[PDB]
Amino acid sequence: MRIPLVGKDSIESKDIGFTLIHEHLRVFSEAVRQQWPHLYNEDEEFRNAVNEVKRAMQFGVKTIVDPTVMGLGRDIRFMEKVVKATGINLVAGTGIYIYIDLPFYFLNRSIDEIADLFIHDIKEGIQGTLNKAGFVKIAADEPGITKDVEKVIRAAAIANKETKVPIITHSNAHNNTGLEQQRILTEEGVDPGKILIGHLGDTDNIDYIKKIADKGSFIGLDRYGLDLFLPVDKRNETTLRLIKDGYSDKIMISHDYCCTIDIGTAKPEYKPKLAPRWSITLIFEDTIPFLKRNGVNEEVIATIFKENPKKFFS
Amino acid sequence: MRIPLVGKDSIESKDIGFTLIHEHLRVFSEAVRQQWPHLYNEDEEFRNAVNEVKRAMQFGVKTIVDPTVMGLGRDIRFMEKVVKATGINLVAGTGIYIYIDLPFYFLNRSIDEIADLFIHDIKEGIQGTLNKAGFVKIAADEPGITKDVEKVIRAAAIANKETKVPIITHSNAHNNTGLEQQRILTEEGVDPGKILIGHLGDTDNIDYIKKIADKGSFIGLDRYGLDLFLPVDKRNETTLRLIKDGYSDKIMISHDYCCTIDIGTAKPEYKPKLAPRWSITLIFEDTIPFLKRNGVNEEVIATIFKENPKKFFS
Ligand SMILES: [Co+2]
Ligand SMILES: [Co+2]
Ligand SMILES: [Fe+2]
Ligand SMILES: [Fe+2]
């Protein structure tokens, strides 16, 4: 009776268990898939998602939070089927993922109208189902905090204030967008501890990363495996340094893995150089063992993957 | 047989008859409708489109060309439903409607891959049906010819050269985008006579409009009713001037009417202010009568609404 789950009764936050806070069962461009269905294979997508979730569960993952929202091809019914086939705790979200402008629908519509969409998903349910959103996802990237990006951020703040769900962000680690997202959300009255500023693991600039944590928000070291953003070894070094400097209670770790994704960058022939070891279980194979043999106590692991998510959703 | 029609056998261009070259049965943002179905009412959308098309047919319209493509919510099955209900000849298109960047799908994809999508729709069919595209639609607006906009234009050229279908554009009448579209397409080897440069009726700058006509392309005086872009009377004066100057061989006229559109700008409360007399039959009620009492004969009306679309699709 707190965190809504796809295809299940809602759960208390104290019962979330070991959590992967940022993974995607499937990502696609809504307009492309609608216009050219021949490009997609739902059987393969389902197979890939089920296989990955099953392996995560074998490593002890109890809950997966999937920030696929408008602009990334959120499909609650696809998510339902994956849950059915695996028994995973899956937290679905609402929100809008844009880099520049909103869809034309939003021309001459207020921030209130946008927030209403989020509240609908949180209180009523997603895409005509009774599966409810457990959080709001927003984005900004290379283009910075544009007018429309800002509208979406302020709409997310309204939704959090009304429903108490936390906010997960996508940011670009190199241009201050994460710090700006946090600033705007907190100014709108969002509790800093209800914000996860995403993709900060894409940089080794620990001074910037600590600024965000210092202002009270979780920091997303959340793209493990995506070497094109930052290699695994450098991520590991950065994660280890943050832990040693006392930032464990702010750290969240994940892969941002896409069991299937439709962008051209994700073509199989680019995998070897861009993301050779990227999968939903890389941290069990590399990161966690690495931390443990570099003096990191098990209590820190519990904090990052259990306590922090519990707090985020409380 | 030459021009494919939705839900009908293809027709020869000589049988196209009185044509509205740019009208929309329904426009929506794909991602918004997919994520928040509660905002839409397909019954109402269907009724609106059927009612408008029936009135157009009563006034002698034989064929409607509907350039709703990716980015505007093309839905071939909705189009089929309207054809069945009305008996209209409906030409559907392929293409991409963007102002700034392509959907993320297109990250690291070639211009050829884009063209392949268009060729698929033209040669195989649209959205898994046997209804084929009869033209390619591209756009550019206030942001100008961005890198991604330019890719789409060049993709349209490949599609035209390969399949001979014509190209219809959306442009901004005030920033030279129409002229640039024409230049890029012709430089790629597209026959200027297979291009309609759209939304030129949004300006009363006849020197600009004539520049495009002189270069061999049709000029889209195609937003009659949309006063916020240019009021009916000034459009009429511009149209009449171009006709008196001898340009009826390049003129195409339409409303760009949307029987339903989901953008906030089109909320009913704004209609009286922005587009009070906008509908799919305005040119029958105002424009054509206006031209006639200004000495324009039935032959010129025939050239614009029958002969020009015939040539365009030949
Ligand atoms: Co992201
Ligand atoms: Co247009
Ligand atoms: Fe993500
Ligand atoms: Fe249009």
Residue numbers in the entry:
A (entry chain C), B (entry chain A): 1 to 314
Manuscript excerpt for this entry:
The catalytic center contained two metal cations coordinated by four histidines, an aspartic acid and a carboxylated lysine residue. A structural analysis of SsoPox, a hyperthermostable counterpart of the PLL family from Sulfolobus solfataricus, has revealed that loop 7 is shorter in SsoPox than in PTEs; linking the active site to the loop 8, which forms a hydrophobic channel that accommodates AHLs aliphatic chain. Indeed, W263 is located at the start of loop 8, involved in the dimer interface of the enzyme and positions the lactone cycle of the substrate onto the bi-metallic catalytic center.
Conversely, the LacSV group dramatically increases oxo-lactonase activity and 3-oxo-C12 AHLase activities, while the phosphotriesterase activity is mildly modulated and 3-oxo-C10 AHLase is decreased. The analysis of the normalized B-factors of the variants clearly reveal that the substitution W263 is destabilizing (as confirmed by the Tm of the variants), but also that the active site loops of PteSV are significantly more disordered than those of LacSV. PteSV lose their activity before the loss of the global structure (Tm), whereas LacSV do not, and exhibit a similar thermophilicity profile to that of the wild-type enzyme.
